[PDB]
């Protein structure tokens, strides 16, 4: 813990489906949580995963 807030520990917030045991994913592509498909870098229902 750091007094200014340790932001080095990152973790995913959105994912398409349940993963498998002992499996790791590295791709940080923007998740298309909305009904319509999303592209670009940002947008509504297009959050940083």
């Amino acid at each position: 813990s750091k007094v200014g807030g340790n932001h080095n520990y990152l973790y995913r917030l959105f994912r398409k489906s349940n993963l498998k045991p002992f499996e790791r994913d590295i791709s940080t592509e923007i998740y298309q949580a909305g009904s319509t498909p999303c592209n670009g870098v940002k947008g509504f229902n297009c959050y940083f995963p």
Binding site: K20, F22, E23, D25
Partner: protein, 46 residues
């Protein structure tokens, strides 16, 4: 299977021109790879 990549190898002395061998042969496990990658497709080298 669950991130374990298994190599099965066998050297078989054959005398054939175009036909697949007519016989039986066991296949030992050579080396198991614990790398644990995500795989979809494959290509060979010529």
């Amino acid at each position: 299977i669950d991130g374990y990549f298994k190599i099965y190898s066998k050297h078989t002395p054959i005398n054939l021109v175009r036909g697949l061998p007519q016989g039986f042969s066991a296949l030992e496990p050579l080396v198991d790879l614990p790398i644990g990658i995500n795989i979809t497709r494959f290509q060979t080298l010529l």
